[PDB]
A paper describes a structure:
We prepared deoxyHb in the same manner described above in PBS supplemented with 60 mM NaDT in the final buffer and prepared cryoEM grids using identical conditions as the mixed-O2 species. We also compared the densities above each heme in our Hb structures to recently published cryoEM maps of both deoxy and oxy human Hb, as well as to two structures of Hb determined using X-ray crystallography, further confirming the ligand states of each of our structures. Together, these structures indicate that, in combination, the protective oil layer, minimized sample wicking times, and appropriate [NaDT] are sufficient to maintain deoxyHb until structure determination and, therefore, create sufficiently reducing conditions for O2-sensitive samples.
Demonstrating the utility of this workflow, we determined high-resolution cryoEM structures of deoxygenated human hemoglobin (Hb) in various liganded states and the molybdenum-iron protein (MoFeP) – the O2-sensitive catalytic component of Azotobacter vinelandii nitrogenase – in a reduced state. Our workflow maintains (an)aerobic samples by protecting against or eliminating O2 contamination prior to loading into the chameleon, during sample aspiration, and throughout sample deposition on self-wicking EM grids, respectively. Together, we demonstrate reproducible high-resolution structure determination of O2-sensitive proteins of varying complexity and size – as small as 64 kDa – with a workflow requiring only minimal modifications to a robust, widely available EM grid freezing method.
Numbering used by the authors:
A (entry chain B), D (entry chain D): 1 to 143
B (entry chain A), C (entry chain C): 1 to 140
Write the structure that this text describes.
């Protein structure tokens, strides 16, 4: 994804202050709560009935950390998103059968989680830069 | 259909928004213009720069419409009928743009009400804004 | 949100479909399975080959549900409540799949009713199938 | 767009029996009727109030002829769609500001038009092959 030098610098600086363990689980849990049809892919995680049970699920927390680790790996390689996400794209398409629209839903949920965590520091320019990175990761995963 | 629990959460979230609604609407519009520049084509006569009084007034109007929708959550389709006619018959707005504005409104609400933006409130607000977008895109 | 004109269009088109409803539903399901193979993951226990009796019976069921929707067009949400509960709460079907099945139903109708598939009837059927998908994707 | 030899042979044979002037205008007119927000782009063409006015519009017919010519050009170059659809992608993005979802809507409308024209000859395998070509043209235009 092409970003200006200011956009890339802002994206990396906000990312450094991200807590890897907390943010990804919160985005995965909020995806599962807001879009309840996504629980079809995670019914093996255990109890996902109430939002309080979804956000208190260690499996959801651990999977979210792996999803955020993948997001960080994509962020470190913004010029080769289609290359860093090839194996994950194959995994999500051929064996899991996940629609590409759900990747965009998860990216928007992650943007909301970042806004919730950073408040006024999540300026509209930072949000625009993160929207483009999230769309690029979704497009790379959808290939 | 909007759940009574989701309905209570939306009223509490928007009541806590309170008098900051016009600024939140203007900031959401600014976020939409910045992240989705294709939406700026609907405002060719506007000044869409930061701190623009035109965007501020439009955000005030959009926030007042959302406040009226919250107050008339039971009867949105006829509480928002003139807006539906304007947006569908006159302006011809793509429903994807309604989705984008709902997302930017959610981002503004998250950035301004951290404690209030629980996952349950987030889901309630997402579905309330989806219902508003459905009403505004309904053509009749 | 349908109009009397497109309601009349839908009633006439489905009445002309008539007794071929089950065959048309099976054909639409086969088209969806062939064109969008991801939808096959919702039927892991089915035989999804051509001429399959399981797909034929399921297409008959889907066509009967659509016939009931046409006959109860003014009260679809409470006419399709059990199906809404099944598809949303139990099966957890992505709404994109509802869009895909509506498209394949339209393609089958176009291929089987050339004269009946005018642009007005096409728009009416698109709106009716969108209404059905909206009802079936609503969580209560 | 990757297609089997049988898929490519079936796609080309159906395309040979397509009438270039009639099919594209019917797909453009049906797009304008079924999705009325798309008339924002075509306001210059003229009267588009009723479906009868839309389908009896010579500007709509001529533009549909152009669009179907572009579709045929893409069909002749199915292995380089992103290359043949680059100037058109730039035109539709930078100057016209058309959403990529509308390309998929137009492709589905074209598939319906082909089904309506060819009847029982438009078998489900032919439809599947044509859906893949239509998605590839939409992805190429959305780049
Ligand atoms: C949008 C960006 C996404 C990224 C970067 C991402 C990342 C990942 C990663 C790194 C894994 C590896 C887990 C492993 O190898 O054990 C994984 C697995 C998985 N992903 Fe995603 N994911 C994304 C979106 C989604 C979405 C939207 C869904 C469902 C709606 C989903 C469903 C799954 C499932 C079910 C697994 C396997 C988990 C298991 O079997 O326990 N992914 N994902
Ligand atoms: C989603 C919730 C929305 C609400 C509550 C809303 C509300 C409003 C209101 C109250 C007005 C002023 C009407 C009047 O004063 O009579 C308006 C006008 C307008 N809206 Fe929206 N709107 C929404 C979505 C959108 C979106 C997504 C777009 C475009 C991407 C849009 C484009 C416009 C335009 C172009 C005008 C005309 C303003 C002018 O020309 O001065 N609206 N809207
Ligand atoms: C207009 C749209 C649809 C209609 C009218 C419809 C109708 C029906 C009906 C009548 C049944 C049988 C329920 C019963 O016998 O109690 C059923 C079951 C089912 N439907 Fe749908 N359906 C629609 C869309 C979809 C879509 C898009 C999918 C998946 C992509 C889907 C997946 C299923 C599944 C998996 C079952 C269970 C069948 C079984 O396990 O035996 N449905 N539907
Ligand atoms: C696969 C989808 C599409 C293809 C292959 C296609 C192809 C074309 C072609 C060949 C032209 C003529 C370019 C020229 O004359 O220089 C054109 C122009 C245009 N297209 Fe499309 N198009 C597609 C989808 C759409 C859609 C969905 C819309 C609107 C909703 C749209 C709006 C326009 C407009 C407004 C023009 C310019 C017409 C004018 O200025 O009079 N196109 N497109």
């Amino acid at each position: 994804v092409h970003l200006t030098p200011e956009e890339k610098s802002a994206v990396t600086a906000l990312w450094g202050k991200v807590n890897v363990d907390e943010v990804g689980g919160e985005a995965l849990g909020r995806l599962l709560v807001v879009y309840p049809w996504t629980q079809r892919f995670f019914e093996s995680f255990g109890d996902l009935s109430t939002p309080d049970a979804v956000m208190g699920n260690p499996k959801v927390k651990a999977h979210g950390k792996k999803v955020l680790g993948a997001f960080s790996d994509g962020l470190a390689h913004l010029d080769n998103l289609k290359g860093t996400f090839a194996t994950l794209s194959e995994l999500h398409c051929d064996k899991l059968h996940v629609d590409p629209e759900n990747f965009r839903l998860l990216g928007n949920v992650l943007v909301c989680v970042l806004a919730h965590h950073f408040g006024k520091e999540f300026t509209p320019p930072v949000q625009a830069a993160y929207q483009k990175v999230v769309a690029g990761v979704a497009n790379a995963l959808a290939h | 259909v909007l759940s009574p629990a989701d309905k209570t959460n939306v009223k509490a979230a928007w009541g806590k928004v309170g008098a900051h609604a016009g600024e939140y609407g203007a900031e959401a519009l600014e976020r939409m213009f910045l992240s989705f520049p294709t939406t700026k084509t609907y405002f060719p006569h506007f000044d869409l720069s930061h701190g623009s009084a035109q965007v501020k007034g439009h955000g005030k109007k959009v926030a007042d419409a959302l406040t009226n929708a919250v107050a008339h959550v039971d009867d949105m389709p006829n509480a928002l009928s003139a807006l539906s006619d304007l947006h569908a018959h006159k302006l011809r707005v793509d429903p994807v743009n309604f989705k984008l504005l709902s997302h930017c409104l959610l981002v503004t609400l998250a950035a301004h009400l951290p404690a209030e933006f629980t996952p349950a409130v987030h889901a309630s607000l997402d579905k309330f804004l989806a219902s508003v977008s459905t009403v505004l895109t309904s053509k009749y």
